[PDB]
């Protein structure tokens, strides 16, 4: 299962034996982001705006803690866009799924998020964020052509293109009327 | 008069070429942006394995 969340994300659970369980979108006290971890400190300090205390020395007894098997997991490239356009917690793969089945799963859905006359700049900015890891040269270009339609002047070019997009059916109609005149006017020159 | 008649002709040509280029620039952008999106969808995605040691920053 995948689900979209708000940035910044911070979760710190104090454990009973005196360690702390941390999952956080940003670094603090040398703890890496995005991967969770069990954290212990030798001297009281403030991390993620709260106090992580040094635990009381304990006596060792025979353990019964479980040790689960490790597991690599491959996710779809655009998992973030799939989770965002559902607005609920959604199933994205299985532990033991093939590359082919995994891909043919949100492909039709994703293809039909096509370019529109009404949010071309907002679309072009998604395409860049999607392309950045694949082709960084193209991303930087797309991002540029994004900010040109949005920012340059008062966004007048964005406006102009948006409007010329919505007019397409009228233009064809006129274009057709011109041909029907031109053909007649031409045929009415030949002897 | 001849200069004004010539100016009108030259203006119309540059005005025609101006549009026929804009038609070609917009057409090429729509083709390339839509293909890249298709390729973005089918790329291999990230891998996660819950290894902390791997993500250490010094």
């Amino acid at each position: 299962w995948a689900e979209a969340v708000k940035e910044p994300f911070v979760q710190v659970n104090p454990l009973k034996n005196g360690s702390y369980l941390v999952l956080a979108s940003s670094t603090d006290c040398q703890i890496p982001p995005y991967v969770p971890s069990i954290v212990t400190v030798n001297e009281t300090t403030s991390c993620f705006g709260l106090d992580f205390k040094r635990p009381l020395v304990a006596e060792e007894r025979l353990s019964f803690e479980p040790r689960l098997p490790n597991l690599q997991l491959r996710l779809p490239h655009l998992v973030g866009i799939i989770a965002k356009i559902k607005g609920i917690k959604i199933e994205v793969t299985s532990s033991g799924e093939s590359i082919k089945e995994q891909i043919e799963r949100a492909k039709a859905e994703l293809l039909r998020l096509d370019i529109h006359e009404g949010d071309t700049p907002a679309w072009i900015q998604q395409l860049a964020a999607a392309t950045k890891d694949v082709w960084p040269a193209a991303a930087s270009a797309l991002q540029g052509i994004g900010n040109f339609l949005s920012g340059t002047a008062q966004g007048i070019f964005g406006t102009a293109f948006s409007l010329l997009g919505y007019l397409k059916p009228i233009l064809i109609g006129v274009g057709v009327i011109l041909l029907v005149i031109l053909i007649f006017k031409i045929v009415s020159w030949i002897p | 008069y001849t200069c004004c008649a010539t100016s009108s002709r030259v203006l119309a040509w540059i005005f025609l070429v101006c549009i026929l280029l804009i038609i070609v620039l917009v057409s090429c952008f729509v083709t390339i942006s839509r293909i890249q999106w298709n390729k973005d969808i089918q790329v291999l995605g990230p891998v996660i394995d819950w290894n902390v040691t791997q993500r250490a920053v010094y």
Partner: peptide, 11 residues
């Protein structure tokens, strides 16, 4: 396993 050394201010 991952041992680290977090620096703390001492002014």
């Amino acid at each position: 396993s991952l041992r680290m050394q977090h620096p703390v201010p001492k002014y």
